[PDB]
Design a protein around this ligand. Structure first.
Ligand code: YG7
Ligand code: YG7
Ligand code: CA
Ligand code: CA
Ligand code: CA
Ligand code: CA
Ligand code: CA
Ligand code: CA
Ligand code: NA
Ligand code: NA
Ligand code: NA
Ligand code: NA
Lengths: 162, 162
């Protein structure tokens, strides 16, 4: 697919923070980087592995892939790609924190657990190539205001602002 | 330039850790991402700005650009691009630390100063989007074994191994 139909471009423009022109430019890049119009987890993994040669980005890349892959069907289509870039780059602080929460909520149950947060920190450290546990412990002491071992989105947002 | 001449591919293959086939594959990607065959600082900046929407990667991207741009002429040619990826991805630990030293040595005088290191840490924090100063202070206490306020490559390597 070389170019998007104007009905699709319009739809994506109303649904994102991008202009009609930016949507078509983003699509040109997407297809050049993904000739099939869809990126599977292997290809997302390859991308990250090439950008971070000093470490092992496999774990963090998987976490990011799962946020891009909204419908969880194992592939990132252009609609999912451009929506993620729209929110992460031009969304409200509320929308951006909501996106980060999704990244951190690894099993998608609406709660971030201590284990989930430690997996994020561990993954970032591996990708790079005070420790993880003490980090998580402090974060949860400062955000888990009901001390139930889980962070809701409000807890994550309230603390992240603080 | 669609494809490289076999004399050039051979040269790059002997000069890098890549195979003849990998050199040509890397060139296909480079040209698709850089149609003119050369990336200036503006374009490198754009790339990083698109990958890190939550922060400001301008400062760190500049530091990385200067390492890629070995001859310091303001553009990254394919030969410089593939050499950087060769060292960062397949070099000895010694070669990889030497590359990191170049990144950190912002003015290229063969020494990393406290200010240079704080600029690196500050840039990484901005890109992301214990503090920087305390970090630098500890690193220099553990690596500046002659306490002259500068890190030579041997100091950086010895400590980085430690
Ligand atoms: N050892 C060590 C050591 C020690 C202390 C340290 N501090 C910091 C570091 C790491 C700093 C980052 C290095 N990055 C910069 C980006 N980069 C790169 C740019 C463009 C690219 O483009 C593609 C593509 N696929 O097109 C792939 C690709 C990759 C090269 C590797 C470090 C390392
Ligand atoms: N607020 C907040 C907040 C709070 C707490 C947090 N912890 C961690 C975060 C940030 C985590 C990373 C987010 N990245 C992932 C990569 N990514 C992306 C992937 C493919 C891409 O491809 C292109 C292209 N140009 O093709 C561009 C492009 C960009 C989207 C943004 C965070 C944020
Ligand atoms: Ca999907
Ligand atoms: Ca969860
Ligand atoms: Ca809670
Ligand atoms: Ca150059
Ligand atoms: Ca210097
Ligand atoms: Ca010294
Ligand atoms: Na729009
Ligand atoms: Na999630
Ligand atoms: Na080789
Ligand atoms: Na340098």
């Amino acid at each position: 697919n070389s170019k998007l139909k104007p009905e699709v471009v319009e739809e994506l423009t109303r649904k994102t923070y991008f202009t009609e022109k930016e949507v078509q430019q983003w699509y040109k890049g997407f297809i050049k980087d993904c000739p099939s119009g869809q990126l599977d987890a292997a290809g997302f993994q390859k991308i990250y592995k090439q950008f971070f040669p000093f470490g092992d980005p496999t774990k963090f890349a998987t976490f990011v892939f799962n946020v891009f892959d909204e419908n969880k069907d194992g592939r990132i289509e252009f609609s999912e790609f451009i929506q993620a870039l729209s929110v992460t780059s031009r969304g409200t602080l509320d929308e951006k924190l909501r996106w980060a929460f999704k990244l951190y909520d690894l099993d998608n149950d609406g709660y971030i657990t201590r284990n989930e947060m430690l997996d994020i920190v561990d993954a970032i450290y591996q990708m790079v190539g005070n420790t993880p546990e003490k980090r998580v412990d402090r974060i949860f002491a400062m955000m888990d205001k009901n001390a139930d071992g889980k962070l809701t989105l409000q807890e994550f947002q309230e603390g992240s602002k603080a």
